[PDB]
Write a protein that holds these residues in place. Structure first.
Motif: not given
Lengths: 281, 281
Positions: B43-48, B56-69, B92-96, B117-118
């Motif tokens: 999931v995270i690699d696909d988001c990146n 944009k560069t986004v940390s795993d922590e930030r992604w995990i925070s976005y994916v919680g919902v 969800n994460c990438v559109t956020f 692609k997704i």
């Protein structure tokens, strides 16, 4: 005794009040789209062909009566694509026939390919997929909600739940998603695709349709009518309800004016043109 | 002024009242979806990858925070397709991220193909087109409404106009249209495709999100918040408004219970799960 109830005592007064509201808030008279004899012939032939697999026969007079709403409710000054316009004529009429049928006689296998055929004839590939999906979702909803507890719950709870159901059920989301290619206006195209277009125009269309169909629908036991949410036999209760519905229409129309000029013209022509058509003959 | 206003004094009390309402009306508490290490990594690699063309560069922590919902607000008992589930996580994460960007830096040319692609990776052909169109429409709406008089009109007029805007803007129509393949349930699929699913759940999601985001949004001059429609500095006016919003939530939830078992589970898990996530540490 809801089956025997009637808004006939308010027919003239409500007609007058609807028109006065439009004159105050919209001003611009709707104008009817004229089809050439050849265009009308093509629409009718395609209507007959779509409905022939179902063994249904419909007179030219009935087709012309059904197509009236499209002729009066589109926005003539903004039309760019008459192929898309003819598609909406055909799709409106044949789905109206589908809605009128005994649901036991609904044959998706025979009908869906006819809707696809219409969309592929008149639209570009992208638009054809959008218009078809909307048509498919509409007729499928029509089938699903016959005798549904969801329909009962949504239509009897509050005006909020009822209009929420009618966004799809009155066919306005479908209308927008087949009508945007007529205009080729990027803003309108997006409002159609997001359904914000349908959401803005649902109440104005539904309130008018429901008022003029009430007596017939109530006699047939149909529950999809907002006036069933008030006691129509009580003059003061009806008048308060009717005013609340006028207030809904006005608030929608006034928010509609925040949209771009072409989009607002299309929205207002639809609500006002529908009223003119409903009330004509 | 409104920029310095706050719902902080009502934070504890409103949190308790939201929970009390859910306990009375929904009962069944939401449970969290657990992803394996490999699933989460994918999931995270696909988001990146989707977001890299936008600089944009986004940390795993930030992604995990976005994916919680997504982990909290889906319906784990009914999951049938984890490929579709992962797609929702990614989309969800990438559109956020897109929503969070300066709109001058939006690049549809770069971003839209990543969205495609997704969808093509995770969904079958038909579902990929539906999920993609919903994503495309969402991100386009996000861009269109940034400094829009339409947004101003819809957000400032009444709760009715405001929630009509949020059906799209809060992303719930998009959510339903990318989430139905998780469940492979024909009735739910149709409610997602007509947007009735989004219309039923908009108020429950939006009221909760708005309450918990109010202070931040108001200090940032953001107008997309229903609590801007009341005077929050006036205790009795706030409480009247908040009670009206609870009543809206209750009416929706009680009508949601008319839908079939799976559908209502998905709808209620979404509303209640979102509340649990929003309120989480």
């Amino acid at each position: 005794d809801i089956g025997r109830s009637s808004v006939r005592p308010y027919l003239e007064e409500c007609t007058r009040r609807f028109q006065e509201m439009f004159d105050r808030h919209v001003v611009t008279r709707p104008t009817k789209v004229e089809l050439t004899d050849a265009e009308l012939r093509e629409v009718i032939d395609d209507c007959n062909a779509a409905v022939a697999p179902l063994g249904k026969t419909v007179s030219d007079e009935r087709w012309i009566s059904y197509v009236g709403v499209v002729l009066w409710s589109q926005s003539p000054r903004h039309i760019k694509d008459m192929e898309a316009f003819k598609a909406v004529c055909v799709l409106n009429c044949v789905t109206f026939v589908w809605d009128d049928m005994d649901p036991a006689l609904h044959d998706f296998g025979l009908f869906l390919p006819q809707l696809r055929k219409i969309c592929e004839k008149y639209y570009g590939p992208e638009d054809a997929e959008v218009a078809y999906e909307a048509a498919r979702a509409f007729v499928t909803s029509d089938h699903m909600f016959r005798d549904s507890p969801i329909k009962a719950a949504l239509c009897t709870t509050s005006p909020e739940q009822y209009f929420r159901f009618r966004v799809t059920d009155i066919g306005v989301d479908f209308w927008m998603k087949m009508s945007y290619p007529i205009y080729r206006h990027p803003e309108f195209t997006e409002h159609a695709k997001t359904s914000l277009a349908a959401r803005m125009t649902t109440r104005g269309l539904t309130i008018v349709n429901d008022f003029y169909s009430y007596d017939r629908e109530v006699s047939l036991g149909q529950i999809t009518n907002c006036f069933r949410l008030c006691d129509v036999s009580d003059e003061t209760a009806f008048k308060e309800f009717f005013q609340a519905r006028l207030d809904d229409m006005i608030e929608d129309i006034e928010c509609i004016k925040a949209f771009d000029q072409l989009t607002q013209d299309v929205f207002l022509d639809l609500i006002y043109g529908n009223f003119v058509w409903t009330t004509s003959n």
